[PDB]
Amino acid sequence: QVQLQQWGAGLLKPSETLSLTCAVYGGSFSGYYWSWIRQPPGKGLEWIGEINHSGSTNYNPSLKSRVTISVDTSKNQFSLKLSSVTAADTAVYYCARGRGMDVWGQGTTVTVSSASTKGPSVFPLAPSTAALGCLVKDYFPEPVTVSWNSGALTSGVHTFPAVLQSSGLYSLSSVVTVPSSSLGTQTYICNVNHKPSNTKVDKRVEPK
Amino acid sequence: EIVLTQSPGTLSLSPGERATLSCRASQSVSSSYLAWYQQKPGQAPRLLIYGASSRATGIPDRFSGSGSGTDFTLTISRLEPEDFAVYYCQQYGSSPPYTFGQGTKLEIKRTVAAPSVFIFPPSDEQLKSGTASVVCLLNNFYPREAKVQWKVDNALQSGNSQESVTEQDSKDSTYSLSSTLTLSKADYEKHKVYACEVTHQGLSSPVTKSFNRGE
């Protein structure tokens, strides 16, 4: 079973270079085409370039001026390098083995933003069945993990994907529908965890 | 330049029904130069076919392929619950750059479900920060095609509301939607009534949920 393992820096400041590397373990080298692919958020896939044992650099004209692919044979690895990156390059990058393309790497999410890391602010969307939730606003970068009652409440919970606000920070919401009888009986608390900022927030949501 | 094209953009069928996805090419492409991929949310694309009907190693026998020249077709004879994903086609081995198709999302087919609408005003904690976010939630609805509109004093708002929708819930095959309307503290304290009106197929008429900045 051939396997691919990728690594590299994920969060990059705009107007700098991105460097990713991919290692092939359990398969042959040469006779396969080592390709790179990126998938923007909510979009399809784009073919970047390929390479083989030697320097068979065949890039994509949409980004050819800023892309370079290299290969190292003593370690069975190949590296992708992008220059003068912007926010348009934010995507999930994969390395793959064109043969079609059979085995793919696990992928790395690479975001480009001039914003800095900031902890989230959690506010309560109070009830008035019934529904209540938490608003996790102004955090960077993704992700954040939201649970309810420290994992006790899981049913009826809907945590929504974040949105890139105009300020450059992310914001999402986590709602839950509960029978209105428990509003005075059960205490509903949302736990928000943000690893990039090393932050945790327990917010109690009581009827307003 | 060979561009690939997939239709429909969203196929909605029940588990057990036969699924037929299409791929259209600009130039004429040999049937051996086309490939298909299945991708699930968060995971890498899984190769299905690498030729016309060349079933890749480790792919169940329900997947098949056909086509010629410009029109190609991926086919699932009997849909299983693990088959609902996003499928792409790719031109490989003809003219670089070897681009992909736009993708075809496969969806589960359930009955029409009207959304449950709720509206959350900005909490008093957020107003002390200088901004106010009003939230509108549509819980458990099908199909996904539904529109939401914000109105401050019955005035149509635009350019200040963001939207998010979850994946299809694996329990009831429904969706959930949340729209955030963001306004400064001054613009929020300007006006009185805030309303969120949703239009969806399961509603006989658009449904509005409103609150007044005070009561």
Numbering used by the authors:
A (entry chain H): 1 to 82, 82A, 82B, 82C, 83 to 96, 100K, 100L, 101 to 127, ...
B (entry chain L): 1 to 27, 27A, 28 to 95, 95A, 96 to 213
Describing publication, verbatim:
In this study, we investigated a donor who developed a family of potent HIV bnAbs with different lengths of an insertion in a critical framework region following infection with two founder viruses that were closely related and underwent extensive recombination. The bnAb lineage is defined by a CDRH3 length of 22 amino acids (aa), an IGHV4–34*01/IGHJ6*02 heavy chain (HC) and an IGKV3–20*01/IGKJ2*01 light chain (LC) gene. A greatly reduced ability for donor plasma to neutralize N332A Env-mutated pseudoviruses of different clades identified the V3-glycan bnAb site as the major target for PC39 neutralization breadth. Ab crystal structures show an extended CDRH1 that can help stabilize the CDRH3.
The naïve antibody is often referred to as the unmutated common ancestor (UCA) of the bnAb lineage. The earliest Ab heavy chains from the lineage were detected at 9 mpi in the bulk HC NGS dataset, including a sequence with 99.4% identity to VH4-34*01/JH6*02 and lacking any CDRH1 insertion. Reverting the single mutation in this HC, combined with a reverted germline LC sequence (iGL), gave us an unmutated common ancestor (UCA). The UCA showed no reactivity with glycans on a NCFG microarray v5.5 (S8(C) Fig), arguing that the lineage did not arise from an anti-glycan antibody, for example elicited against a glycosylated parasitic or bacterial antigen that then developed specificity for the protein part of its epitope on HIV Env. Our study showed no evidence for glycan reactivity in lineage precursors. Therefore, it seems most probable that the lineage was triggered by the Env antigen itself. The glycine at position G100C found in the WIGEL motif is present in the UCA and only retained in 11aa-insertion Abs. This sequence provides a glycine hinge to the unique mature bnAb CDRH3 structure.
